[PDB]
Amino acid sequence: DSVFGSTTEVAQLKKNYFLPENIISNADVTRLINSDEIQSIVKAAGPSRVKR
Amino acid sequence: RSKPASENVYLKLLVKLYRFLARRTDSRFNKAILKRLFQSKTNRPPISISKIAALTSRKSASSQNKTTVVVGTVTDDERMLTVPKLSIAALRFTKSARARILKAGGEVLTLDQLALRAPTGSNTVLVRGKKHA
Amino acid sequence: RPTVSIYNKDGSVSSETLALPFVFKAPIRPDLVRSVHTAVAKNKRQPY
Amino acid sequence: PTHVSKTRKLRGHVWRPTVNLDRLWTLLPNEARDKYLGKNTEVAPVINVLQSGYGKVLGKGRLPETPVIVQTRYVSRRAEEKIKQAGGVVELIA
Amino acid sequence: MKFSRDVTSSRRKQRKAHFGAPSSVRRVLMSAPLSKELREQYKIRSLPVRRDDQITVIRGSNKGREGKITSVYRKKFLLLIERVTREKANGASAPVGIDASKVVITKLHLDKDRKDLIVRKGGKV
Amino acid sequence: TKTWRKWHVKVNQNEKRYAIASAVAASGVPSLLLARGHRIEEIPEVPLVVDD
Amino acid sequence: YVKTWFNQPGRKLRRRQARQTKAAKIAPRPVEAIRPAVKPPTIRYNMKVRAGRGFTLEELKAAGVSRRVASTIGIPVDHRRRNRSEESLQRNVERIKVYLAHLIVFPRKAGQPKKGDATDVSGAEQTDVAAVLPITQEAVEEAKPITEEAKNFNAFSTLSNERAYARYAGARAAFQKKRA
Amino acid sequence: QQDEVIWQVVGHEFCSYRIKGEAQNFCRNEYNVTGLCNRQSCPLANSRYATVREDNGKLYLYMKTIERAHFPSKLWQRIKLSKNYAKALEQIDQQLLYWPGRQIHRCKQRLTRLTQYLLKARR
RNA sequence: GAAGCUGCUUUGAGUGUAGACGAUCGGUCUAAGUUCCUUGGAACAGGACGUCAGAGAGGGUGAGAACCCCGUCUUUGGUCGAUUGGAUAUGCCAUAUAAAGCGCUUUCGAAGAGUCGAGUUGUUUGCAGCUCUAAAUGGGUGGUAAAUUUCAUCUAAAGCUAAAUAUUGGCGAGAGACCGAUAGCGAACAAGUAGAGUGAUCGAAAGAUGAAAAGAACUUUGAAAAGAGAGUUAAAUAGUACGUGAAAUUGCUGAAAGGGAAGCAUUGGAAAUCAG
RNA sequence: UUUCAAUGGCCCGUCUACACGGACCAAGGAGUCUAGCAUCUAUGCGAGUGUUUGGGUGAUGAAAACCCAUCCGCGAAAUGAAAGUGAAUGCAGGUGGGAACGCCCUUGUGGCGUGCACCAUCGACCGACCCGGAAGUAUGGAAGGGUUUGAGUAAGAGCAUAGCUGUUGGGACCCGAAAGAUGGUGAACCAUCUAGUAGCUGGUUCCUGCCGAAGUUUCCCUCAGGAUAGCAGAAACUCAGAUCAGUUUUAUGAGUAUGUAAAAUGAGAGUU
RNA sequence: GAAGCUCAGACGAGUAGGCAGGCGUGGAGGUUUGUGACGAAGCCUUGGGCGUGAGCCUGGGUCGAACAGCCUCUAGU
RNA sequence: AAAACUUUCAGCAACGGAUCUCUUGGCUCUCGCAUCGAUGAAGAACGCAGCGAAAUGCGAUACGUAAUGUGAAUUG
């Protein structure tokens, strides 16, 4: 904690170094996609692999 | 274009998420983000807290609680000392800009958070950074 | 923030536990590390 | 890296820095801004632009109404009046 | 792992110092182990070989044979032992070289100088 | 071949710290350790901490 | 021809061993001598304070140490420099004073205190001089009130016209001597 | 961090249990059933799955749990089957009925081939 | 700074002994399997059972050796010499009727000449030849002015001086994302060698038997060179024209084709030979 | 695999039928490194940015890694020849338009909007230019008037690193011309400068796929050339359009053709 | 193997030139409990297989000590 | 419509010395040190070994003597 500091408070043993903050808040994209906040709005899913 | 030129895995997750949102819904906002996430770094100019504050409290206002959305960097503007309460979603916030929003104001969001909040992009302003550079 | 259990010389679980440092919440960027490792491993090359 | 290069594909194919009024209040330490901006205090903050390597104080921008004394070598001809109605004072460094 | 800045891990230099050594150092390189009994007797691990030393061949086709070093042939890094010989084609006999590392000392050529050498290596004479 | 070829290469100091933190955080993910080749099938805990 | 820098780590390590060898040679006394507080000579840098070469003969005279004693005990003396503003007198004076205050001189000839050198000798310690004697920057002021008399002072009343007055002073002076 | 970022690191390019060839890639990892590298069957990248592997005349199974997945010693637990090829089949489908069924068709098929070993090994 | 005046401060260009401190050389001291089975000419290989590790750098030994060997680590060390580093203490001489530093001055302050400089010629402001040739608040140099001036700063024409710095040579060390015998130095070997040119100079080619010469006894044929048997070897498909031995190229055997070319391609037949 | 039959098959490379090179084989053998500049992409940070000139630490392996110090460079301010002055009009503007979104009328469409980048315009804001001189200590400046000016301000976007490509300079893709100088040896030769002048001659090393011109334009030239197009492209953004056409037709004036305008016809059509 | 699966339609000469994906070589970091004196590399071959191709895998013979796959770096490729 | 001859194919043997593996060599970088000579240097010539022709070693004391150290060789 002293060496690397944190993403919000400066490191004690590195002057003015804040841990880089992630580009995305959550990396569990599949749970985002299958979440109710998304699956409730998506239009009727088209067919998967189809017959010729 | 059909894919982003970066190798950032976290950016590719955004592309994966928003490909689904664009092709499984009719929201043109999702298509707009997908086209802009594919763009190169110099085609995604920064935006400033000063500009966003001006663009919200502009003329008839009409901002209220609408979350501002920009695909790029949200830099700070030290020329302003009064920062209003704002809700902003972007790829990345500079350290100074994030602190100024949080300490006196509203919230900062990432694009995946915005999708879990407004997947159709309802009640958002889709600002863009100045391409004059 | 979770906590981790320290272990002993004999291999048993110790009583005390430590909070998980914030460094373990940082992004995992394989491409940035490869680019830096590519350019740091060049810094102990003797000229020929 | 030679392996990506085009040669490995042609085988066969033959003195006065300037500061404007929108930036004086950014030259303070943040605690000075915290405890001195907007508060009706008898004593006003003092800004020495020369300590930030700035020679002439130009007058671009708007001001907060907090009184503040600015110490400078040279100053533009509007930069002083804007700080008049800002309630602070300008006095000139030797 | 070496840490002194004075020694070489380089193969080039180590081979040159080995094959290009004087006789006063080749004697050190021809050191042979002591057998268990005399090892525990003297508390010593190995000594440089000497003429008239009584040894046993541990490795090679000459394994198990005993004898005495009739002469240490330092330049060729060989040792010579009687009755350890090869039948020449014509009918003569020419002994064979067993390297100092592959023998074991069973009976020393004890001498005053060898006595001080043993007692100098923290040993008991 | 000349000796004054460009042997050493600059890297932004913040980028170096970014990558060191990312490799440290990556050392706490048992999936990453197994893929890299370490045998942690019976390690009690990743991260692993022994006493002082 | 082509100056290469492959010895840069080597040269850095040489200096370290040079300092360590030098310091260990004269361990009792500080490795780095003291320097006065001096101001860079130009309009770009005159605000700053840096370390000069030595203390001028005015300052040693004021501090009560002769120019001979100062050299013996590690105070460098600069004869070329002359200090004119009596603050430069001052700021260097207590600098010498505090250096003497923290200074401990081992008695010569088997530890019998001579004059006022010292009595204790076990306190031998090699310290960084910039620790006990750091050089500070200019003391800036903070939170001074009023000066509304300077408010009416409308800058260019001095600047614009006195600059013109300075520019035309030669012509003006020539005029006055002409009609006289 | 999360499972997609783990897959994006190890799955695509580097893993110690992955085997690339001319144009095909296999997963040697002892906890995968289909033996091939994908996000649906990745051992390292994904949460709890089920696999089986041979030992000196019997078969035994690997599983995970989500709470304990930070402690690799007992992250996987081992259960043993050494009674019959058929009874193994009923056991395996039973222990995955309360679990997602996208793996059974690969899992149950893997068994019989492992048991076919024992028959052919006996012959 | 000299010369007068004052009261504080000080002091060696010395000489034995003891102990500590470092520098180097010289030497000495350094942990643990060579225990079994298989292959092999050889175990340093594979397997089993162990050991040391401040030592799992490296090299050698009849094939990949931490434990056979030299070493490596402990080592910025223990020991033993030898001198020296100067400090510490000590002892003895010294001479010390002493001189110097700083309060003051009642003042005196010497200060580098064919040099500076000017004109002139050459050359890269600097220097040099040429003729003239100085001065004492003078002289040099600049901000100013003004073309003159104030102002600032320094004291040339005598001299010494460690450190930071350079180092394709010399000698000694450690290394390499280097080259691997037409490469790398011209030179891995009998290399500035053989050799060439009157001469200055020029300047090659050439690494590898084997673990050990065990470098082939002996018989026979031939004058001999050599051959054939033998004999050594794990191996002569390792015989000194020596590891591996490619192509161009030549000879022998077998097969096939061919009446002023051939080579190549597509389709099949025949002969040979595979394959599922 | 060999051979036979039928059928076809000029020797390859280079220049412009030739000519020039090629007896055969093996090995070597030619766009390299570096500095500057420019575009583009990526990474870090962001009104900041860059610590490797330097200091600390790292002795168990130490030319690394890590830490500290921003003097300074570039950016944050432009204009003027220079003295010198030195940039939100207008929710830091309007004017129209303009992204998505909201926003519906609860369908959507359409609109309501909002307006990002912007886009064009403009209102202006600072410097220079010109006219005027409120004042204020000869000095001096304001208010105000220009439709003269700037890749100006108008709510900063740059800095560092790596890669690709292009270009400039270093031997400069490799090979090849007489010559000239310096210093020597002998009665012309030698060694260095030299890896020279090369505007040329010759050569320039793997595969597949995709897109694919030009020879004449646009002018300009002292010269060869460039331009410039065209073509081929590469990136950004409008309208589902009369938005086009190596085309026809109708009408229309003038003396089948001419043009303009509009029906047919095919195509998503523009751009900077 | 979302860098994946699937359906449909049209199209296919090519110089300078523009673009993309691959084959091969020496050395570096990482990984494969990787191969090997019960024979590594090399070399030969009327032996076999794979790829449109660059090239790759293998059988037999000779040989005798080191070598390769994957992900990256690098160049006297 | 043979053989010889030429050509092609394969086996074997020659010729040649590629390939592979290696290496007391080179090259590059860094670090350390300062030491020639009229008290005869650098270089050259002639000699010196039991048998050496080679390379180094040496100077009529001549592949060295004195002294110290090691401890029992030298080698075709």
GROMACS .gro file of C-alpha atoms (C1' of nucleotides) in nm, chain B residues 6 28-29 36 40-42 48 50 54-55 57-59 73 75-79 92 94-96 121-124 126-133, chain J residues 40-48 91-94 99-103 109 113-118 154-160 235-238:
model
   72
   58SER     CA    1  -0.568  -0.072  -3.056
   80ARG     CA    2  -2.878   0.491  -3.311
   81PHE     CA    3  -2.690   0.610  -3.002
   88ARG     CA    4  -1.666   0.649  -3.250
   92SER     CA    5  -0.823   0.668  -3.397
   93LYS     CA    6  -0.684   0.864  -3.104
   94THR     CA    7  -0.652   1.191  -3.297
  100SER     CA    8  -1.305   1.986  -2.084
  102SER     CA    9  -1.551   2.387  -1.861
  106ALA     CA   10  -2.113   2.535  -2.055
  107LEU     CA   11  -2.288   2.280  -2.277
  109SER     CA   12  -2.608   2.515  -1.852
  110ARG     CA   13  -2.655   2.657  -2.202
  111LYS     CA   14  -2.939   2.890  -2.304
  125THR     CA   15  -1.086   1.210  -2.245
  127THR     CA   16  -0.970   1.694  -1.907
  128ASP     CA   17  -0.996   1.959  -1.639
  129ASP     CA   18  -1.002   2.335  -1.694
  130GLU     CA   19  -0.832   2.524  -1.413
  131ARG     CA   20  -0.976   2.851  -1.548
  144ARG     CA   21  -1.115   0.806  -1.920
  146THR     CA   22  -0.773   1.281  -1.599
  147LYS     CA   23  -0.684   1.259  -1.231
  148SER     CA   24  -0.750   1.628  -1.167
  173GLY     CA   25  -2.890   0.618  -2.422
  174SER     CA   26  -3.209   0.777  -2.291
  175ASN     CA   27  -3.171   1.135  -2.162
  176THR     CA   28  -2.805   1.180  -2.254
  178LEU     CA   29  -2.354   1.299  -2.678
  179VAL     CA   30  -2.088   1.570  -2.690
  180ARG     CA   31  -1.773   1.549  -2.902
  181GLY     CA   32  -1.427   1.695  -2.858
  182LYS     CA   33  -1.299   1.979  -3.072
  183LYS     CA   34  -1.136   1.832  -3.384
  184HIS     CA   35  -0.951   2.157  -3.460
  185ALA     CA   36  -0.686   2.049  -3.206
 1123C      C1'   37  -0.008   0.814  -3.969
 1124U      C1'   38  -0.113   0.448  -3.587
 1125A      C1'   39  -0.053   0.285  -3.086
 1126U      C1'   40   0.072   0.357  -2.547
 1127G      C1'   41   0.124   0.704  -2.081
 1128C      C1'   42  -0.015   1.158  -1.888
 1129G      C1'   43  -0.305   1.601  -1.984
 1130A      C1'   44  -0.261   2.250  -1.936
 1131G      C1'   45   0.050   2.032  -1.866
 1174C      C1'   46  -2.589   3.190  -2.108
 1175A      C1'   47  -1.731   3.331  -2.358
 1176G      C1'   48  -2.253   3.499  -2.863
 1177G      C1'   49  -2.594   3.514  -3.228
 1182A      C1'   50  -2.436   1.438  -3.367
 1183A      C1'   51  -2.682   1.142  -3.108
 1184C      C1'   52  -3.005   1.192  -2.766
 1185G      C1'   53  -3.397   1.318  -2.542
 1186C      C1'   54  -3.867   1.487  -2.682
 1192U      C1'   55  -4.258   0.875  -3.936
 1196G      C1'   56  -3.627   2.027  -2.972
 1197U      C1'   57  -3.140   2.038  -2.811
 1198G      C1'   58  -2.744   2.156  -3.016
 1199C      C1'   59  -2.164   1.830  -2.963
 1200A      C1'   60  -1.794   1.820  -3.306
 1201C      C1'   61  -1.885   2.147  -3.620
 1237A      C1'   62  -1.376   3.371  -2.824
 1238A      C1'   63  -1.423   2.877  -2.255
 1239G      C1'   64  -0.680   2.628  -2.434
 1240A      C1'   65  -0.435   2.053  -2.639
 1241G      C1'   66  -0.019   1.960  -2.628
 1242C      C1'   67   0.424   1.675  -2.429
 1243A      C1'   68   0.690   1.212  -2.406
 1318A      C1'   69  -0.892   0.888  -4.393
 1319A      C1'   70  -1.352   1.246  -4.243
 1320C      C1'   71  -1.852   1.417  -4.344
 1321U      C1'   72  -2.328   1.554  -4.607
   0.00000   0.00000   0.00000
